[PDB]
């Protein structure tokens, strides 16, 4: 009846105005079986990682144009400490294994009031590469404080700026005009999503199961799911009201598994 | 299999490290991975099994490039303690290796063979 | 009818909900995914080998390296360049200047109806000649292997090794056609239409899968090395998915507005 | 596991013998001798007779 | 029949000459109940910490006198990385809690042969303070490379050099002559122990349950159990034989529990 | 008889095992732990209060601080100094020079038979006078509290506050004795004979328990502040464990060889 409270481990979250919980593809997204591509003893969930982890995004401002977006690669967020996120036990255990698989639960929060106008779209895009710079290297924490909100242009629309394999000098460089990771703004509502606007609610909750091309993926590189936020109607408010609303989100892993124990990972 | 004098005594450490950025280089690192302790005694041989831990069913049998589907880590042997020998015995014993398929080993998808051996 | 679109789930209705009327009959089921994709189509055009070949080197290749280009074709809907998997489709809008021109390919229909994320299916291949009264053959090897490059001497006549091997080789009569089907042989369970992972643990290129294809194909003339002709020849390759399946929705290309 | 290789006969094991784990499924049987050798291949090249 | 193999998790240990396993006080030292002094949800064992951790001690030499000893505080060994020990997952989880309780299993290894003479005593002394310098501060890793083997003297015999509370200057400093933590060498065989000598065996295994003055103890300071090695008969061997034997040990925790989750500990 | 002592466990035998003979009868059971420890003994000797007191400050106390020393006695077998728990027993072998001399105590018999690690028991207290025909009283407060220090004015006669309170206070007639029993009231479940932990999370002194005692005791003269006499007085304290228990073996002191 618009009041709900979600509990897990030693943490609990509530809301004074809810719209429901969206289950992605199945009746019970939590149910899952151990992987069949490894024969060692796996490591199921323990009570110290059944939690909600919270972080902070950049603030929404009226100067933002339409279809500008922000992205958050789920398994990569912990590893890169984006937006101040820190997993503690989950991060420590993820840094000490070779393989990992798990679903997710996410929720976003905003604090608009009845005197504001605007709308935000929140969706979970699978198998995306919005977190990588055109040169092919992951964005540093300094770049986010400059590109507050990612712009939208024909390059993103057509996937013409994807990661690039240098072709050497024996050939002659061609003209690149299309790629498989394009983004089509008008069709983003295909993925599991909820629409957030000033007049109706202040939070959105989505539940998602595991997906991958193999039963399990490498810990340090898998990027199957990604969180997306996009602007549909630019913000506007009467002069004198509260400005620059804040945004926050929380995440929870479900039915994890691990395999291939080893020492702390180190790049080389 | 240990083929040294019957009077010797010692211990060895065997470890298997899944893939990482850099391979192990010390006992402290080796202890954390999968490993076992083998001690010289009456019986001479000791068997070790490399578990099949892979991100996908089936794996390639040749490594054109070190994708995760071809290379699968390293195996290393560590001398836990030095060997003890009585006076008037030869030094530097030797150890021997054997390799074989497991119980649940399987192959698939034949391919043409390389004739370079004739040269 | 009153409803809330913010909930994400909206129940489809009919004319009778708010007005007087009735629902229409089913009709036909031509939208079935299995029935839609079982149709042959052109994929690529390649030359015909007349001697032992040298497989192209990896992409960081500098100038001056000797190899054979445009003789091998990959079997995969994804973009490719220089007989190796790629990530961005290419196009030469100014055919001039030095440098070798890179072969390219794509499956226009498949990516025009690529509404999902993962795919799996068998595949049937066919080849056709583009020259009058030509004799040729076609060879194939599975995903994750390589082409043997050498020859043998019989009666002082060199014979390339690709004549023989325990992986299929087929011959056609004057003006004939070659046809056969292949299984799904990649190590991965499904083929990713779009990907965002990395294969190697470091120095990898994100979004470039390693084994998203069925195999590799090439054509050659059944004659010894001593009969290298003076004119190039070409053939055309046709593929046809069989018993297809899909697994997760996605979005379609962006049709630009003039 | 302790064993003696000098006896010639050694019993094949699995991952579970010395660690926690389980055995894998069979898979396919492409190694069968009868199925392996039924494939054509080149043997020799010869000339054509035009007289006795 | 003198051949045994101990298995746990993804690790296994063996021995060609065993004498048995000593159980400290009960029939099954592993059985244990959760603590009754906290009401939050505890964290039981998970498959990634059921292991044996191995380390290296300093080498035995003929110049060592009688009753010289070496000590290893169990829960403190992981925290101080003594002898190259590193717990990985266990250490990471121990650094992120307030309370902890668990038993132990230990084993030591040596490689003497039939042509050597000597004996070593291995015992588990409960509630000891042999790991602290006279000034009251924990010994640094540099001190161990100088004091290879701890000497024995009247000070240790009488506990006359225990940690000291400075008494100020208002009083007049007295003469200290006795303390409750004395060590009596001739009675060390009271504690659970096994005797290691050249002619009989090369390993000793002891099993020990949990003990404490409260159901649970603080993670960063509890020191209930301690491992002890002492010399009974000084080493001797004929000229030309192997010199300076090595020593090693391995540890395993059993039936752990944790409470009071928080972030990484930091001194201040 | 042949045996192996390295195994740690050795089975006790009798005379008949290797020779002709027989076993002896039981006898008596005076070694029972409960029966052994139920005997009173001297613990400490303290002075008698004649006014409001000032509890001694913590140990880092510098010079010039004003307080009262030697008026309070702890109830615990462990060593103590200056009415506060300690770790090392003290002894003044040269009573000379400046500085205040620190009171000390210990339970010689208890530590001579302290063969275990943990202990728990009730405790019965008694007091006795060391002066002819003295009138006095005894007060007590539980572990983990403090002594109130102030006075009140009745009819222009100051009366210390320790006269009143809801924690036991007892009076004795001319030449009488005071006796009563106390429960086990510390927060810890058992009293550690020897300890190796730390109480505070940092800057602590290892091996110094915080609440290993039963309480605290003192004696005072029931007269107003206006009758502070000219001569000091002393009393003696006796304790007696009751219904004791032990939990884990240990070793005994080191009897030095001349």
UniProtKB/Swiss-Prot annotation, chains A, E:
Q: Which cysteines are joined by disulfide bonds?
A: none
The record gives the effect of mutating residue 171 to A as: Complete loss of viral replication
Q: Where in the cell is it found?
A: Virion; Host cytoplasm
Region called Interaction with host receptor ANTXR1, residue ranges: 155-176
Q: State the oligomer form and interacting partners.
A: Interacts with host entry receptor ANTRX1.
Task: Please explain the role this protein plays, according to its UniProt record.
Answer: Forms an icosahedral capsid of pseudo T=3 symmetry with capsid proteins VP2 and VP3. Together they form an icosahedral capsid composed of 60 copies of each VP1, VP2, and VP3, with a diameter of approximately 270 Angstroms. VP4 lies on the inner surface of the protein shell formed by VP1, VP2 and VP3. All the three latter proteins contain a beta-sheet structure called beta-barrel jelly roll. VP1 is situated at the 12 fivefold axes, whereas VP2 and VP3 are located at the quasi-sixfold axes. Binds the host receptor ANTXR1 for attachment and uncoating (entry).
What is this protein's name?
Capsid protein VP2
The scientific name of the source species is Seneca Valley virus (isolate -/United States/SSV-001/2002)
UniProtKB/Swiss-Prot annotation, chain D:
Leader sequence range is none
Can you say where in the cell this protein is located? Virion; Host cytoplasm
How is the subunit organization of this protein annotated in UniProt? Interacts with host entry receptor ANTRX1.
What job does the chain carry out? Answer: Forms an icosahedral capsid of pseudo T=3 symmetry with capsid proteins VP2 and VP3. Together they form an icosahedral capsid composed of 60 copies of each VP1, VP2, and VP3, with a diameter of approximately 325 Angstroms. VP4 lies on the inner surface of the protein shell formed by VP1, VP2 and VP3. All the three latter proteins contain a beta-sheet structure called beta-barrel jelly roll. VP1 is situated at the 12 fivefold axes, whereas VP2 and VP3 are located at the quasi-sixfold axes. Binds the host receptor ANTXR1 for attachment and uncoating (entry).
Name under which the protein is recorded: Capsid protein VP1
Organism expressing this protein natively: Seneca Valley virus (isolate -/United States/SSV-001/2002)
């Amino acid at each position: 009846d618009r009041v709900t409270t979600q509990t897990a481990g030693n943490t609990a979250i509530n809301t004074q105005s809810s719209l429901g919980v969206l289950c992605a593809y199945v009746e019970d997204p939590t149910k899952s079986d151990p992987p069949s591509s490894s024969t060692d003893q796996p490591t199921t969930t323990f009570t110290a990682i059944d939690r909600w982890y919270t972080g902070r995004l950049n603030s929404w401002t009226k100067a933002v144009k339409t279809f500008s977006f922000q992205a958050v690669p789920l398994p990569g967020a912990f590893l890169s400490r984006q937006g101040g996120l820190n997993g503690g036990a989950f991060t420590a255990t993820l840094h000490r294994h070779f393989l990992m698989k798990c679903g997710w639960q996410v929720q976003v929060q905003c604090n608009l009031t009845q005197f504001h106008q605007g709308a935000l779209l929140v969706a979970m895009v699978p198998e995306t590469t919005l977190d990588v710079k055109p040169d092919g290297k992951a964005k540093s924490l300094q770049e986010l404080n400059e590109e507050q909100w990612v712009e939208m242009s024909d390059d993103y629309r057509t996937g013409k700026n994807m990661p690039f394999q240098s072709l050497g000098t024996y050939y002659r460089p061609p003209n690149w005009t299309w790629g498989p990771n394009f983004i089509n703004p008008y069709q983003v509502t295909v993925f599991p999503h909820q629409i957030l606007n000033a007049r109706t609610s202040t939070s959105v909750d989505i539940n998602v199961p595991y997906i991958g091309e193999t039963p399990t993926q490498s810990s340090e590189t898998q990027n199957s799911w990604t969180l997306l936020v996009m602007v549909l109607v630019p913000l506007d408010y009467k002069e004198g009201a509260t400005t620059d609303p804040e945004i926050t989100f929380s995440v929870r892993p479900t039915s994890p598994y691990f395999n291939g124990l080893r020492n702390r990972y180190t790049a080389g | 299999t240990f083929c040294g004098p019957m009077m010797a005594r010692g211990k060895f450490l065997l470890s298997y490290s899944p893939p990482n950025g850099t391979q192990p280089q010390t006992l402290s690192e080796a202890m954390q991975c999968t490993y076992s302790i083998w001690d010289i005694g009456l019986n001479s041989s000791w068997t070790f099994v490399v578990p099949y831990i892979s991100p996908s069913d089936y794996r390639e049998t040749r490594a054109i490039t070190n994708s995760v589907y071809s290379a699968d880590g390293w195996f290393s042997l560590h001398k836990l303690t030095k060997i003890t020998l009585p006076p008037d015995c030869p030094q530097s014993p030797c150890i021997l290796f054997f390799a074989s398929a497991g119980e649940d080993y399987t192959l698939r998808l034949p391919v043409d063979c390389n004739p370079s051996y004739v040269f | 009818s009153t409803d809330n679109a913010e909930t994400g789930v909206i129940e489809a209705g009919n004319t009778d909900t708010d007005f007087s009327g009735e629902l229409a009959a089913p009709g036909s089921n031509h939208t079935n995914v299995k029935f839609l994709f079982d149709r042959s189509r052109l994929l690529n055009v390649i030359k015909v080998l007349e001697k032992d070949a040298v497989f192209p080197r990896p992409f960081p290749t500098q100038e001056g390296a000797q190899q054979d280009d445009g003789y091998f074709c990959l079997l995969t809907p994804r973009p490719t360049v220089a007989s190796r998997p790629a990530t961005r489709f290419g196009l030469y809008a100014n055919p001039s200047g030095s440098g070798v021109l890179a072969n390219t390919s794509l499956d226009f229909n498949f990516y025009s109806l690529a509404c999902f994320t993962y795919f799996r299916s068998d595949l049937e291949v066919t080849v056709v000649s583009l020259e009058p009264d030509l004799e040729f053959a076609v060879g194939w090897f599975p995903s994750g292997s390589e082409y043997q490059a050498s020859s043998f001497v019989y009666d002082q006549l060199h014979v390339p090794f690709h004549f023989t091997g325990r992986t299929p080789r087929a011959f056609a009569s004057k003006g004939g056609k070659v046809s056969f089907v292949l299984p799904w042989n990649s190590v991965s369970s499904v083929l990713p239409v779009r990907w965002g992972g990395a294969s190697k643990l470091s120095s990898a290129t994100r979004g470039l899968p390693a084994h998203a294809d069925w195999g590799t194909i090439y054509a050659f003339v059944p004659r010894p090395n001593e009969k290298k002709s003076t004119a190039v020849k070409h053939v055309a390759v046709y593929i046809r998915y069989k018993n297809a399946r899909a697994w997760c929705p996605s979005m379609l290309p962006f049709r630009s507005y003039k």
